[PDB]
Structures are given as C-alpha cells and as structure tokens.
Amino acid sequence: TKIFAYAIREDEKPFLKEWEDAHKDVEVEYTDKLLTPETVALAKGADGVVVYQQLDYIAETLQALADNGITKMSLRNVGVDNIDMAKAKELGFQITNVPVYSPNAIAEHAAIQAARILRQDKAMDEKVARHDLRWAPTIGREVRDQVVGVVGTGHIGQVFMQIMEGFGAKVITYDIFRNPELEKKGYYVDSLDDLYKQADVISLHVPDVPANVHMINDESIAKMKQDVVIVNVSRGPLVDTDAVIRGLDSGKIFGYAMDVYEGEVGIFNEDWEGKEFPDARLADLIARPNVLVTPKTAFYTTHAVRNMVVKAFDNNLELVEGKEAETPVKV
Amino acid sequence: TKIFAYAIREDEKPFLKEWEDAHKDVEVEYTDKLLTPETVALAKGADGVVVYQQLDYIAETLQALADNGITKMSLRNVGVDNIDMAKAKELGFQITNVPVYSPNAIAEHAAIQAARILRQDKAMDEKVARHDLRWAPTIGREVRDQVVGVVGTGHIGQVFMQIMEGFGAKVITYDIFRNPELEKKGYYVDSLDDLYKQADVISLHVPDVPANVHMINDESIAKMKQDVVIVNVSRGPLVDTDAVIRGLDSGKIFGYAMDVYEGEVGIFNEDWEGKEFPDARLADLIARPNVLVTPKTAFYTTHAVRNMVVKAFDNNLELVEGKEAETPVKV
Structure with missing residues (x-):
C-alpha cells in the first residue's frame, strides 16, 4: 500500500x-x-x-x-x-x-488580535521601536471592561465566546440560527442592530452567504458604538473595506483586525518584498497603527x-x- | 474643602x-x-x-x-x-x-504578550510589513496546547490563571504560601524545579524580595523545557537579562515578553527618538522578532x-x- x-x-x-x-x-x-x-x-x-x-x-x-x-x-x-x-x-x-x-486556531487568533487592538499594542510597539519609551498617552482598554459581540455561534464563534468570558468580558451574540443551549444561557440579543448598539468589540464568525456580503458597511458602522473594535477572521466579502476605512478615518472605529480581505486572492500568501505592491489600499491598511493585517493565517x-x-x-x-x-x- | x-x-x-x-x-x-x-x-x-x-x-x-x-x-x-x-x-x-x-491590567498584559510570542505574531507582522505575505513557515502555537506555569498566586497571578484557563491551557502554579482553594483544586507543584520541568509558558507574578533576585538565570533556564516562553511583567530584578539572551541566542527559549528591565530607570518613560540611546542591550532586545519589550506599561x-x-x-x-x-x- x-x-x-x-x-x-x-x-x-x-x-x-x-x-x-x-x-x-x-x-x-x-x-x-x-x-x-x-x-x-x-x-x-x-x-x-x-x-x-x-x-x-x-x-x-x-x-x-x-x-x-x-x-x-x-x-x-x-x-x-x-x-x-x-x-x-x-x-x-x-x-x-x-x-x-x-476551531481554536481561528478563535484564538480573533481573541489575540482584538485584545491587541484594545490595548493599542501596535501604537506602543511602533513608539518603542523608534525609541520613544514614554507610555502616555497610549493607554490600554482592558478586555474585561468590554461588551463583546459575537456574530455567528458555530464552533469557532463558541470558542471565541469562551476565551472572551475567560477574560471576564460580558459576551453577547447574534446568529439567525439559534443554538438552544446558548439561548437558554441568555447570550442572544434580539437583533443584529441590537448587537451593534451594545458591543464595544465585534468579531465575525459567519459565512459570506449573499445576505452577509458587505454586512459591515456605512450603515452598520454608523449604528455601532463609538470606539468600536471590529475583527474579521472569517471571510473577506463580509466587510466593505472602504466603509471600514471611512470609519477609521473618521475616528468612529477604534481599530480593525483583518485576517481576510476581499481582494486577497493572488496577493495574500505571495512574496511582494522588493516588488511593486499590487494593491495600494491593502498596503495602507498594513501600515496603520490601529490595524492588524494577517494574510489568512488564522488556521x-x-x-x-x-x-x-x-x-x-x-x-x-x-x-x-x-x-x-x-x-x-x-x- | x-x-x-x-x-x-x-x-x-x-x-x-x-x-x-x-x-x-x-x-x-x-x-x-x-x-x-x-x-x-x-x-x-x-x-x-x-x-x-x-x-x-x-x-x-x-x-x-x-x-x-x-x-x-x-x-x-x-x-x-x-x-x-x-x-x-x-x-x-x-x-x-x-x-x-x-490586577487585570497586569494579568491581561502578561496573557496577551504570552499568546503573541506563542503565535509568532511579531515575526508575521515583520514579514507583512515588508510585503512578504506568505504565511509559511511562521507557524503558531495555540495557547490551549500549552502547559502554563504561574509563579505566584496573589491577585494578579490568579487573574492570569483564569485567562489562560479560558483559552483551555493546562495551568500549574507555584507559591511559597499556597491559597487553600487553589490547593484543593490541585494547581500547585511542589517545587520551582517541577514547574520548570513541566511548563511551556512561565509567567512571573511574585515580588522582588531577596530570595527571588535573579531567579531566572542560566541554571533555572537549563531546567526549563525546550521552546519555553518566558513572561515577566512583575519586577526587573527577578531576571538575569543576559541569561535570557543566552537562552534566546541558543534557541532554547522560544521567546521573551518583558515589561520590566533591570536598569530601566532613567531609560524607560523617556523619549530617545532621533537621539542617542543609552543602552545597547535594550535596543537589541526591542528589535528581536521573538522579544516584546514594553516600558512598564502593564498598569x-x-x-x-x-x-x-x-x-x-x-x-x-x-x-x-x-x-x-x-x-x-x-x-
């Protein structure tokens, strides 16, 4: 054989x-x-x-x-x-x-990135690498102080819920399909708009079916909380990237962690070092102090x-x- | 008044x-x-x-x-x-x-840095920043796959234990004065030597008292597990910095997170950008791909x-x- x-x-x-x-x-x-x-x-x-x-x-x-x-x-x-x-x-x-x-591979990546955005860890690292060792005014936000909203309660979403609860955060969730056990424990909010209203952190764990395409857009970011932290380790098309960049530019969105990107195909998992970078928008996101880009490495x-x-x-x-x-x- | x-x-x-x-x-x-x-x-x-x-x-x-x-x-x-x-x-x-x-401020910083070193997040970030978007060979280690050893079970140590357990890691601890409830639950090992033999991750949550000066040194690092991750957000003098550098240089120690540094006073919390840096060892530690230096910002x-x-x-x-x-x- x-x-x-x-x-x-x-x-x-x-x-x-x-x-x-x-x-x-x-x-x-x-x-x-x-x-x-x-x-x-x-x-x-x-x-x-x-x-x-x-x-x-x-x-x-x-x-x-x-x-x-x-x-x-x-x-x-x-x-x-x-x-x-x-x-x-x-x-x-x-x-x-x-x-x-x-499922933990992916959920852990989402949790780590969210916690780093909240801490302003990249802003701190950029300062320190330049040899500005002053801590102020780069103050952190504790995970335990946040209301974390989980969009999608499949295997990955449930591990993310567990990790966030371990930190002591309040966890709420939305899924058009309701797990009876999670429902019993009272995790589910009444609507997606209700999750946008309550959450300081939003992490996406749903498939990009037609209804979920560009679910993160000008109108949903306008419904979110001031200083909201958005995390997407699930699927590129879930997010209208230009809308998230407008939310970052305006200061409505505190930061963004993306392990996926509409436009990733042929770019992610390729070496562009020393070559001309194919996508200016992605290059700009990579370099922002409040954005964490990874090239679909959650797995x-x-x-x-x-x-x-x-x-x-x-x-x-x-x-x-x-x-x-x-x-x-x-x- | x-x-x-x-x-x-x-x-x-x-x-x-x-x-x-x-x-x-x-x-x-x-x-x-x-x-x-x-x-x-x-x-x-x-x-x-x-x-x-x-x-x-x-x-x-x-x-x-x-x-x-x-x-x-x-x-x-x-x-x-x-x-x-x-x-x-x-x-x-x-x-x-x-x-x-x-306590959470400090425990969360330890947990976030630990998770990051395990993931090789800084090595990935450095590649992504240079436009090398290939994920291999920068493979991550899940937190849940580790045995996490907690040195000190006061308030901070206990929050760190809670976070690491929320990830699904196995948590072991050492304290000279055992907390009765933790003891009940079987967390404690009998000696630091036992903690070193068993732990994949070691995080220090003990004070700078005489018995703990340079507790991390060439001898204790030789007892540690191959690919150990060391975290110190507690006190500078706990750690013989050169002994950690030797462990990093040999490949014994997978990575190091330090929020404290023996002889950091006067260097930390000052801006040296565009100016002469007073410590060559610290400048090298800041820039290693498997070291995360923060300037006493855990609080x-x-x-x-x-x-x-x-x-x-x-x-x-x-x-x-x-x-x-x-x-x-x-x-």
Missing part, C-alpha cells in the same frame, strides 16, 4: 512521520512541488494521493493522475472549489477533504496542521482499503 | 470629572505641572494635595507645601521611595498611596488609571475630614 503526497511543507513533516510510525505497513513518499500535469508521474505506483494547493485541480491534471493510476485524492484543506468536478466524476474519482481541524497553528495532515492521510488510506471515508467530498 | 492635584494627564481628566460629580461639596483644581518648591504655592488655599511623579519630594518641597498650609498628600501611584520621610514626619505629614488598582489601562485617580482623591478626602484613610503610608 502506497500514498504519495504533494506540496508537503517543512512544518507538515513531523505529522507525516507520526502517521507513518502508526501505519508501518504503508509506504509514504512525497514532494514539495504542487500537483500539475507534469508532476502527476511522481504518483505513478501509488494507490492514492494527498494534496493541498490553490493551483486548480484541472482536467488535464486529473487526467494526468488517472493516466498514472490515481483515482483517490485526499485534500488536507477545506475548499473543493478549484477542482474540475465534471472531469473528476468522468474519471471515477473519490475525493476527500478535512473540514474540521481546530496556521501546529494543532491545526497536524490534523490537516493526519486526517487527510486517514481518509486516503480509507479510500484505498475500500473503507468508508470519514469526510468524503461530493464529486 | 478644596483638593489641589499635580501632574494631571489628559487621560486622567475623565476620572477627575467623575470624582468631582460625586463630591459636589469639594472644590477641585489642578495643574499638569510637577510638584516643586515653587509650584507648591499653587496649592495655597487647599486642604490636601493629590500627586504623581518621579521627581523627588524633597525636604524643600515638603517644607514649601507646609508653608502653604498643606500637610496632607495623596499619591495616585504606588512607590514612596522618592519621599524625604524624615522631613515628612518632622513636618507632621499624612501620606497615602494607591497600592491596588486593577496603563483606563480601568487602572480611573482607580488611581479616584482612590487617591478618596484617600485625601478622608485625611482632610479626619477619617481613617483607606491606604495610608507609614511616614
């Missing part, structure tokens, strides 16, 4: 070893290269492949794999949108993914990455052994 | 307003100037003064206060080492301070500052009205 992996990172190696040590009867080989029509031959002789990439799984690429005896493909990540599904089904592909790996922890590796291999071995996959994808 | 205050900052004004509104019978006036022999005159007519400064309260300054009818002095801060006590006693002075203002939050203002005014009013002051200083 053999499994070939693509796009393996240094940081994924320890977990690959851990899976190997637990499945000594299975041969595992890999490369750091992406899966293309040219790299498909590296899989020749394997029973299935483990992949992870933004580079599309094109028809050509799926054909190259089929031609090399591969019809079992297990993704380490969540999204299956860059796969030619027609071709895959044409070829009899069985595809799996890793939908869940660490990127060792707990998460271990689960992305181990779960994908487990699923791939399942396909190979004719066992029911744990987290199958619909092809 | 009249109370005159010195060295009033812009951030303290809101809380001085709040104290006034609750004590409409008292007249309050202030200056942003420090209290000196010549500014002492500003308090003539007042019954008490409210102060906060590093500039010594010399025999001349106390004499001049007494000459303007003031022998009742209320500090908004903690420290009383810059007071000429022999003269104060001679002049019949009554003095108060504010020893407690917000500096709106909750803390509000309490420094209000408790100072309360204590002065008590002196003035002949009541037993809440937190008097032995003169």
